[PDB]
Design a binder for this molecule. Structure first.
Ligand SMILES: CC(C)[C@@H](NC(=O)[C@H](CS)NC(=O)CCC[C@H](N)C(=O)O)C(=O)O
Ligand SMILES: [Fe+3]
Length: 327
């Protein structure tokens, strides 16, 4: 019934004790070849303050403000907002709602914003007088979770037999396509039946089976159990831990390693409870290309074609919406 999801102390990945880093890399390897999930602990981020500031924002924002920040799927006036902005709930039909923001260095003068390159957008923010300190807190949080994610990527590189900057050299403050999503899953009475899906095995869900669109995913959630992973023994429950970050690989890592580190298939159960789900999707730059390899082969060669991260991301975000629906 419960999935094997280990707790790994990732503090050595921030320092210079190389043998201690290798012992962390082995734990990452073992979890990646088993269920595909682990919890990162002793990460240094103040997650209680993150949860308090996010709750202050979700509970004070008003309908007027949501329409003013809405993405194109909800507001035809905002044609440049495909990824960044507010994703509304549909009272009586869709329960979840969220706020997505991208790299704070994507300003109006950034070269990729000037060129209108797909997947790059300038962030939108609420009024400062109505939400004092929110934008400054949220931009500082992007850089705090970016620093954690860079330490984790050093661990994945060592686990696969590569030098510690193998993935991190493609993950940079000036051009990362990474995103933060602040998701609110509400308590509702009565709960809308159209917002509850049912799986082939009978489980009630909020989001169906999928693989993630990311290199890795770095997730904080409230203490309410909800995720399941598909293993050889069927779907198993992932326990909650509101002091750590839940980590897993996305389908760009599976392509690069020839499915040695699989992107685990997972889904979200329906739970009638007020809770938070705050993912950071670790994406590389638009032109980043890592040549595919195969760790199970002596010469490390694979028969897969190289794919740029920008091409992967644009087609992956669309495929996920077509399969499981607009969020
Ligand atoms: C489990 C969490 C990761 C969360 N799921 C999600 O966030 C789901 C599935 S991984 N993710 C997505 O739909 C992709 C959001 C991408 C984002 N708009 C962006 O432009 O980069 C949830 O709580 O439902
Ligand atoms: Fe997911």
């Amino acid at each position: 019934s419960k999935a094997n999801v280990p707790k790994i102390d990732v503090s050595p990945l921030f320092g210079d004790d190389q043998a201690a880093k290798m012992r962390v890399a082995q734990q990452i390897d073992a979890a990646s070849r088993d269920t595909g999930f682990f919890y990162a602990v002793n990460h240094g981020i103040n997650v209680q303050r993150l949860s308090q500031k996010t709750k202050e924002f979700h509970m004070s924002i008003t309908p007027e403000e949501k329409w003013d920040l809405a993405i194109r799927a909800y507001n035809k006036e905002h044609q440049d907002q495909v990824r960044a902005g507010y994703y509304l709930s549909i009272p009586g039909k869709k329960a979840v709602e969220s706020f997505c923001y991208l790299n704070p260095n994507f300003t109006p003068d950034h070269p990729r914003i000037q060129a209108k390159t797909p997947t790059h957008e300038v962030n939108v923010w609420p009024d400062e007088t109505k939400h004092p300190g929110f934008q400054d807190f949220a931009e500082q949080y992007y850089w705090d979770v970016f620093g954690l994610s860079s330490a984790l990527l050093k661990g994945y590189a060592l686990a696969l037999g590569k030098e510690e900057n193998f993935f991190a050299r493609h993950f940079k403050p000036d051009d990362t396509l990474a995103s933060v999503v602040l998701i609110r899953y509400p308590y509702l009475d009565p709960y809308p039946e159209a917002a509850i899906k049912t799986a082939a095995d009978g489980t009630k869900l909020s989001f169906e089976w999928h693989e993630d669109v990311s290199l890795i995913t770095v997730l904080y959630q409230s203490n309410v159990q909800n995720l399941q992973v598909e293993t050889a023994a069927g779907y198993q429950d992932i326990e909650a831990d509101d002091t750590g970050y839940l980590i897993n690989c996305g389908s760009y890592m599976a392509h690069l390693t020839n499915n040695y580190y699989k992107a685990p298939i997972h889904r979200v159960k329906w739970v009638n409870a007020e809770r938070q789900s705050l993912p950071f999707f670790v994406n590389l730059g638009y032109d980043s290309v890592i040549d595919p390899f195969d760790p199970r082969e002596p010469n490390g060669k694979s028969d897969r074609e190289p794919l740029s991260y920008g091409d992967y991301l644009q087609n992956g975000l669309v495929s996920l919406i077509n399969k499981n629906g607009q969020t």
